[PDB]
Amino acid sequence: DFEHAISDLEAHNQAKIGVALVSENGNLIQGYRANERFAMCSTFKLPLAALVLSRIDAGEENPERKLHYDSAFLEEYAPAAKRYVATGYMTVTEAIQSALQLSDNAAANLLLKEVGGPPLLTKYFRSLGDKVSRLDRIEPTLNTNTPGDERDTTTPMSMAQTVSKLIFGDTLTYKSKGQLRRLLIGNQTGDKTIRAGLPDSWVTGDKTGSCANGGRNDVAFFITTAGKKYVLSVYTNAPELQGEERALLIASVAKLARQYVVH
Ligand SMILES: *C(=O)[C@](NC(=O)[C@H](C(=O)O)c1ccc(O)cc1)(OC)[C@@H]1N=C(C(=O)O)C(=C)CO1
Ligand code: NA
Numbered sequence: 001d002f003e004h005a006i007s008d009l010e011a012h013n014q015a016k017i018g019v020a021l022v023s024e025n026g027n028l029i030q031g032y033r034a035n036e037r038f039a040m041c042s043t044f045k046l047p048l049a050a051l052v053l054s055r056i057d058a059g060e061e062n063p064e065r066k067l068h069y070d071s072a073f074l075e076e077y078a079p080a081a082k083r084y085v086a087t088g089y090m091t092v093t094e095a096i097q098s099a100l101q102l103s104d105n106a107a108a109n110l111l112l113k114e115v116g117g118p119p120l121l122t123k124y125f126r127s128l129g130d131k132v133s134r135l136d137r138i139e140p141t142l143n144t145n146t147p148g149d150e151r152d153t154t155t156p157m158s159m160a161q162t163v164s165k166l167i168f169g170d171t172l173t174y175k176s177k178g179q180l181r182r183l184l185i186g187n188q189t190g191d192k193t194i195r196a197g198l199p200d201s202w203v204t205g206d207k208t209g210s211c212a213n214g215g216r217n218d219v220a221f222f223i224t225t226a227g228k229k230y231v232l233s234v235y236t237n238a239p240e241l242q243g244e245e246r247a248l249l250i251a252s253v254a255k256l257a258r259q260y261v262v263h
Contacts (some may be wrong), residue, residue: 001012001087002030002032002257002260003032003260004056005256006019006032006253007032008009009086009253010251013238013240013241013245013249014238014239014241015214015236015237015240015241015249016033016236016237017032017033017234017235017236017249017253018032018033018036018038018155018156018233018234018235018236019034019156019232019234019235019253019257020031020062020155020156020157020159020160020161020233020256021160021231021232021257021260021261022157022161022164022230022231022232022235023164023229023230023231024164024168024229024230025164026160026164026204026226028124029230029260029261030161030257030260031156031157031173033156033251034155034156035151035152035155035156035157035158035184036155036156036158037132037154037155038153038154038155038156038215038217038235038237039142039143039144039149039152039153039211039215039217039235040060040133040135040142040152040153040159040209040217041142041143041145041152041156041209041210041215041231042103042108042207042208042210042217043154043159043207043208043209043219043235044135044142044154044209045099045100045103045108045207046100046163046166046184046207046219047121047124047125047133047163047166048099048108048111048112048115048120048121048181049096049099049100049111050124050166050171050172050176051120051124051131052092052096052111052114052115052125053067053096053172053176053179053180054171054172054176055114055115056092056176057172057175057176059129061092061114062092063091063092063093064091064092065066065091065092066089066090066091067082067089067090067092067095067110067113067114068088068089068196069077069085069088069089069093069106069110070088070144071085073106073109073110074106075105075106075109075139075140075164076105076140077103077105077120077140078104078105078106078107079102079104080094080097080098080102080104080107080162080186081098081104081105081107081110081143081187082106082108082144083140083163088165090107090110090113092114094107095107095110095111096111096183097183099187100112100183100187100207101183101185101187101188101189102188102189103175103189103209104210104245105139106139108138108139108176109138109139112138113149115222115228117138118134118135118136118137118170119135120133120140122134122135122136123240127161127192128162128165128166128171129160129165130158130161130162132153132154132155132158132243133153133154133155133158133159133162134150134151134152134153134154136151136152137151137152137180142239143209143210143211143212143215144211144212145212145213145215145237146149147213151157151221156190156228156233156235157233158231159219159230159233159235160167160219160231160233163219163221163231163233164221164231165219166180167180167181167184167221167231168221168229168231173190181205181221182205183202183205184205184206184207184221185203185204185205186205186208187205187206187208189208190206190207190208190218190220192244192247192248192251193208193218193220193234193247193250193251193254194206194218194219194220194232194234194250194251195220195251195254196247196248196251196254197250197251197252197253197254197256197258198220198222198254198255198258199224199225199258199259201225202222202224203222203223204220204221204222205220205221205222206218206219206220206221207219210246211237213237213239214236214237214239214240214246215235215236215237215251216234216236216237216238216240216246216247216250217234217235218233218234218250218254219231219233219234220232220254224261224263225263226262226263228261228262228263231260232254233251234250234254234257236249236250236253
């Protein structure tokens with residue numbers, strides 16, 4: 001049974017694991033600590049991108065608008081922004097790509113600025129019927145992952161449901177939805193996490209994150225060979241494991257959850 005299997009992973013690895021597998025319409029299929037709070041860390045970038053795209057859908061933003069910045073805007077982890085800084089800008093489109101596929105923190109901060117900041121991301125979550133997820137800080141302080149702290153948190157179920165809405169629901173235009181899906185499929189940081197626990201024949205897109213205090217997270221959508229559509233969130237705090245082992249833990253959790261998909 002699922003509860004036993006995750007419980008053992010937790011004991012053997014000295015780790016805290018939260019999981020939610022939801023259907024295309026957002027119903028919970030299987031979960032473990034599904035309603036408990038975990039820090040989003042980079043996983044917030046997925047709904048951040050969707051907010052930007054929905055502003056584009058509304059004619060409130062242009063995908064080729066230039067977002068200007070200088071060296072003082074850079075962060076420790078900003079590999080695309082470090083590349084473009086001499087030109088003085090990244091387009092909205094380049095920023096969306098970079099934030100999602102490379103987890104670039106300067107790109108993410110540019111997009112937070114464009115959308116009106118953490119409160120307006122929080123308002124977006126509420127507009128989607130997510131009454132739990134919230135953003136309070138920007139990069140890189142949003143990743144502190146202090147025990148008990150509610151700032152910059154979600155729950156496995158709330159994020160899974162939110163992502164199911166963005167990817168499979170009709171909040172976004174067909175155009176924007178397709179762009180978001182394809183960017184996530186092409187994520188460069190998720191090859192050893194949830195996707196590693198799923199059959200290679202399934203279509204998979206995802207957004208990963210790492211936090212202080214050993215946080216390591218992934219949320220993925222997938223489409224099986226039978227065309228059935230799911231979202232899986234996996235949020236972990238495993239301070240006693242090494243880096244690659246945190247990834248293997250997530251992939252092991254995905255391989256367990258996968259058994260609750262029909263086919
Ligand atoms: C998002 O999770 C990620 N990390 C951070 O924003 C944060 C920081 O830049 O201080 C951080 C970095 C390294 C850590 O070990 C812990 C926290 O965004 C840059 C980044 N995202 C990843 C991802 O797969 O998406 C990473 C592997 C590294 O964390
Ligand atoms: Na795979």
